Symmetry: D3
Subunit: 236 residues, 6 copies
């Protein structure tokens, strides 16, 4: 196989890839938004697909949960499959007092409690930073669709089941808008390969005040986010 974790042949992925944690959501995106989609990977159930969106080649693939998982898949996509742009699409929590469930968050950079970026920069602070053209394309696509967005920092944690006192309050004080588990691992890999990455997420829960989007609101948020991402690919 071309990699230990992907049965796709070189060339089977488009230069632009959307990725989400849940492979079954990758399949939903392919089935509902890609034309002439073909499954190109099923190793470990991590479904990946390639088709077109409005005539332009586009792939979508799951990345699993957490920094180590996305790091495997993204490293391979840039190195082996010669992908140029990855947009991560997902859901997130928020702690920011002026961000609400159903909001769409476009990530400019992501903090983390992982050690992976310190290990790349001699132990120093290496900001996991989205590519500006990708950020701008997402922002401009949402404007054209008349969909309000929040633009700012995410925080990528290794621990879904946090026991850490004071973390949420510190994230809120510094206006982190999205809490998720992967973006801080993706951005430095794109940098290593001289490539591009970004992230867009919908807010499912307010971590501080405990609001939670209903199933119907989650479907609407998902449709808005995915249309923003798809339209942005046409400008990238």
């Amino acid at each position: 196989m071309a990699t230990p974790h992907n049965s796709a042949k070189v060339g089977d992925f488009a230069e632009t890839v959307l990725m989400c944690g849940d492979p079954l959501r990758a399949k939903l995106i392919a089935d509902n938004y890609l034309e002439n989609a073909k499954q190109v990977n099923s190793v470990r159930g991590m479904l990946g697909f390639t088709g077109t969106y409005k005539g332009k080649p586009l792939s979508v693939m799951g990345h699993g949960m957490g920094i180590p998982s996305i790091s495997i898949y993204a490293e391979e996509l840039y190195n082996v499959y010669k992908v140029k742009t990855i947009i991560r699409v997902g859901t997130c929590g928020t702690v920011d007092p002026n961000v609400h469930v159903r909001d769409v968050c476009i990530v400019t950079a992501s903090g983390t409690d992982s050690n992976v970026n310190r290990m790349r920069l001699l132990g120093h602070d290496f900001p996991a930073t989205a590519n500006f053209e990708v950020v701008s394309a997402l922002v401009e696509s949402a404007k054209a669709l008349n969909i309000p967005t929040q633009v700012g920092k995410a925080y990528s944690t290794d621990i879904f089941y946090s026991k850490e006192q004071g973390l949420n309050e510190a994230l809120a004080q510094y206006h982190f808008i999205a809490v998720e588990m992967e973006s801080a691992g993706l951005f430095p890999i794109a940098d290593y390969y001289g490539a591009r990455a970004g992230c867009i997420c919908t807010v499912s829960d307010h971590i501080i005040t405990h609001e939670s989007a209903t199933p119907e609101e989650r479907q609407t948020s998902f449709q808005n986010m995915i249309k923003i991402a798809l339209e942005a690919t046409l400008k990238l």
Copy 2:
């Protein structure tokens, strides 16, 4: 759903669960070694099954790749599903000069480059340590099956595609026998819940000498490892 990542209801998992990263390997284990088997989870494609091995209830489920992924699944199994014992089964690399591809490694403790255990113990060194009853059951099962084993430390990394100079040589100097991605995250979660965990792996590659197991060797080693793990469950 009982958790965001698992559609099983409390009671659907046995008290002992084998887990491996690849959900398709979890399915292979269920199909080839469990009787009375039923599928109990398919959220995110992370297949899980419950059946019997030699009459005793046993579950087997995928955990995905990396510490953050296994942490989600294992926290839930212990907390929500009331599981008492998780045995991780998988493949690994080795750096040890006296360990060879095809070998079976029983893990007594695992080091890591993750921050998750420092965060649990006020920044200090918290050894991710296998439960002694579990280690002993694996060791004694292998002896009873006439299968030689290596017993000793693993190292769980967040980065499959390592760029770290000197790491392999240090691991070799201190006789780490297995390099994998998850066990250091599992053992402290078992500790938190007053429960039990262990790990057994097959050596697919020698990271120093670059030897690699043939497909035939990987089948042999899998058959040895899984029989040891299954027989151990009868003693637990």
Copy 3:
């Protein structure tokens, strides 16, 4: 005095402030580009001025050298003086193989070897991240002026006279475009106050290949950069 380091009264600063390390350069900006400018601070020689640019209120003030120095001045400006936006303007080195002397660098986020941001976020990785509106206004201003720009990460070091082996090569591998000493301290303070910050710098030296801008190239680069920043304030 309103603060220990600033004799200005509350209200003496405009809501938007350009800052540079050298107070004599702050004076040069006030003298050559601001209308009806008045000096509002001279404590510690850290000259600050308020006037208008194309009739819009604007202030300019020195910040001194290094994170601790800018942290004092910026904390006071946001907290006591109720400043809404700070744009840092300066010079930088580069290590990136495709960035050259005289290039204009617009900073999206900055790494650092300082501890100040770990101390704000429970020891974790807190990306010092520029405000997107500010970044965009700088990018669009440069486009209108027909000045090419590089957009991406800076690195803010505490040590001008670096002795650190391997740092430059790692910065280059991950495409850090600017090496300076202050931006990583500014952005988190802006966050704390729910305010905005950014940074634009011109490349005076290639740290790896050793090209250095002449005095005349330095003046031309400064003229380009300051016009970009001033025009950006009209959009903010």
Copy 4:
């Protein structure tokens, strides 16, 4: 050293058996030799760190003090494995516990030990290196206790550099993760055994419950010591 085999040990090469019991107090090493070893001879006196070599039930065995703390045991154990060609060290001592199901007088067999020392990070490029006991040693201690009908607790220790701790929240975190023994040396011993391809373990008796403040009486400590040392000595016959 000018004439000694190491700077801290006057024993000649070969004066130590391949299996060595070690405890912090050199006077306890002497008590162990006097009361349990036959054919015994003192082989070290440097720094008062008494060490002895004889036999236990016919098999060669040594016992020597290691002093207090990771740096001290590191000196002695590095020398034992490197210069004296020792194959197995079993640390014997006392400990505190924070675990809610461990009580004073319990015997703890250590599978691995955490620490607040930097010595293991320095061995593994700054990463987490678990100080891990050798499984054959752990198993021999467990099986020896079973044969003597002495109950044991088996699990993690924590080795601290600071006896007089002022650290808030530490005991509660150790209890939450079921650390069974708090002492000062095991985390330094196990990685040195690894470096030399050799074996190490640890067994300790609980003198104090750090949470509930229960404390063993002197007579309970004597019984606990006798049980522990019998377990360790019998384990050496299987190693």
Copy 5:
């Protein structure tokens, strides 16, 4: 120019230099205590002067605020200007229960929350330690002038506007006598060049009790401190 930050020619600085953060205080020292004084640096407003005290050449110059700033100026003074001794003079807070506002503190070593010294000593603890001949010369000068002094540790912070719970109480418990922002960066640079440094400060504020020196007390303490420093230079 001889360096990027100093317009003095080599030789224009005496072998001993007093430095303080505020360049206007450097000018005050020159105006009131040096004879034959001339200004030798004006770059960045960081005024420096050279004259004589009781016939012996002596320089005084500002160093700005924080470790990065003093590091630039001191590295240059030792390396380019061939200075042999730098005595930092300034103001400080105190946390010590036996130290009071108005007191003069002679610094033997300084702690820090900066990373600059870990980076010099392989990540380890490197005490920023004053040169004994300098400490002794200050102590003996004070004794000869019949001025009592406090002698002991300082703490050099990167963050003037501290938000750090428990810091002041730990500093008080261990009898740190002075809190300031620069000494910990100066002493290791002196070590690197085989040169000498020390620090003497006046207590302006008690951080624990909140007492503050009156203007008259600040004048008395300044007069004491500067006379101690000047007399010490005659013995160095």
Copy 6:
């Protein structure tokens, strides 16, 4: 009155010399203290109290390493109400201008231990000798016409160092002494509002591999102990 010391408060003088080897503690008491009484032998860690030229003085072993000295010193300051501890010992050096037989008076000590970060919220806490003690040692050496080196020590947890680049960095920043305990002593003295210092003689040059002979070690020890004893008179 402690788990490691059978003495009771008042059994130690207010000033205590300490060295790693308890047998060297006994040598110091036997050869330099008048009217000396043994006040501890728990764990073999001999301690003694007598007088030097009329002034009460004690001498006791501290064992090897920061954890060991921390136990003994914490107890001395807390239970035994000691006011001044002077550590006396041997050291290595990496400094190009320090040689075997040199006497090193320590002003501060670096370390690879975590004990000081844990006392100061993770930050850099310099283990710093008390100035009156440093000065007393320097002046006593001057009075005896013995040259001294005055400067930084480095206290390591690992005698058998495998660390590449360490010696070269210590040399570049002119650390004059390498040993194993002083960085643990000075912060404990700070905690109790008390005084500590350290003096050591160079037995080995770690870079040049020069090593002191038996005769040279005797001369060096006699020089150092006389400096420390005479310093106690001024403290």
